[PDB]
Nucleic acid binder design. Sequence first.
RNA 1: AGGAUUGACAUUCUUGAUUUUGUGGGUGGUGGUGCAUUGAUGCCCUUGUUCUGGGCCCGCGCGCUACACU
Lengths: 51, 278, 251
Amino acid sequence: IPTHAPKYEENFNPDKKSYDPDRTRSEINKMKAQLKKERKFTMKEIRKDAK
Amino acid sequence: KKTKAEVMKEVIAKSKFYKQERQKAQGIMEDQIDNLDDNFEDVMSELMMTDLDKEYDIKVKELQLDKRAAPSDRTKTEEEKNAEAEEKKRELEQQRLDRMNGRTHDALLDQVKKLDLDDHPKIVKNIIKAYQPKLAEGNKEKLGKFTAVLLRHIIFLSNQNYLKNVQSFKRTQNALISILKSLSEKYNRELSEECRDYINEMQARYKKNHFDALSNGDLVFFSIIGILFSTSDQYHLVITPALILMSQFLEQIKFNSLKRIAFGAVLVRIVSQYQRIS
Amino acid sequence: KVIKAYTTVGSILKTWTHGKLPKLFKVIPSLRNWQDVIYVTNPEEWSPHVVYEATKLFVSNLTAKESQKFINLILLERFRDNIETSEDHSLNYHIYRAVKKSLYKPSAFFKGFLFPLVETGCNVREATIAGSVLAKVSVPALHSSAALSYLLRLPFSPPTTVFIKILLDKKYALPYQTVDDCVYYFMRFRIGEDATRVLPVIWHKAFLTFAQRYKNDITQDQRDFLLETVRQRGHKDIGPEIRRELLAGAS
RNA sequence: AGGAUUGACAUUCUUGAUUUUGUGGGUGGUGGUGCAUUGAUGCCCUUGUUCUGGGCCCGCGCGCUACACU
């Protein structure tokens, strides 16, 4: 039978975003999701303080 | 915690050792430079000026007088030598099995050494090989050239005059094939190029003529290549184009006389002698 | 005198690590004042690179006159102190390269260093180490025979003769100086030593290692006293290969 | 020793057969174990000198759009 090795990430944790090689389009997803979550928390903070 | 403790301790200790070495080098350069540049006035005005040695001088005189050399720098142990010789024979057989599964321009030896036919010629060739290996200061080019004219000497000697009787050319060709195989077993770097020259010459001649200049040296060439090489291995640039060219001779040119059929028959029995071990 | 900063320069040469010689100590061998250099330099500053420059220094400035001036001053005394303080019984790297580089002018090295090494109580182990260290490099034949002549006309003693045992484990050539040094070493050990001086099987192994192939093209007197050897001092390990080689040998 | 080689006052001078041009081949204990505390002493191997090192203690669910010889 034709035999294939896996495509495996050693020390992989699904909660935490690992070291993907794409500096061009994946760390941009990292920092943009960071920016989205902090902008969401800031607008939630200011609207509850407005209330 | 133990990692951090020993790690910070070793890192600070290595940094302290590097700082101490740098301070010692700075003090070295400082004192040495500011003292060597300052001592230019007192590196001029500072001025202050048996039987065993005699017999040692006499022994050095005797040593420069008498000089010799040790024979073979080891021991000739019989059991170790026999084991290495058996392993060398097994290495030769296993290499043959693993490879079977895988100013001398063509007239110098006749101009110098060849006195009558053969007898003085091979002895003077031995004299040339003894004089060249003696005073071989740096020798590759001339060694290749006179081994080339040795093979030249046999390829225009062994064809014309075998007319002198049987045991005479028998013993001179036997001594020649023995010394030439035992001399050219350890090397290939000139016999290979001479074999390229000979396959060029026999292919070109066979294209040139019908039969009337097919020389008698082809049989001697096949004999010397079968003696100097074991033909068992497949991948060999030397023995195989000559064998396909003798098969080309047999398949193409015509044998309309008894000596021509005898020529074909001796080439068939010598390829049978090749396949005796191939 | 000199520039007077040399107690400080010795304090730095105590423990500075990577570099070469100062230009002061480089211009004094063209001068004549390294006596008054070293008498204020106070030679305790033995760092490995300055030992390397020291051995190249005095074997550069080793001729007969200055060799007998300062050939026995501090050097093998420092070797005595370092080996007496060493417990692993091993050659140090600066020791090895010191003597191995000190051989590089054997014009008077073989008369100035190989000769005074038995000055105050030398040991068989010391002769073994010195034989191995100066054995591992190529020596010239005339210089090695110049050392060996005086070394072998010295008497029969183990810290003198296991050095000669390693000198024949070096497996030299055979000039006629080696032949006549061999005949008087043979007359040095034979049967007033017959009651007090004994000889064990390590020196039988020494006999094996020079009688291995020290019989190339030599005469019949050698055969005479080597048949005297096989009659007098035949151990069990001396027989087969040696008698085979005596039968195979010729004149 | 008629330029065989050895430390250079940023080539340029105060060194003398350590040798080199062509080629054979040999290695290694300075670690220590077993015996009297110096005896071809069984055993894995042979070919020990100088600076810097390394992250940390989002989860959930709803919608919308995919992944389909339907």
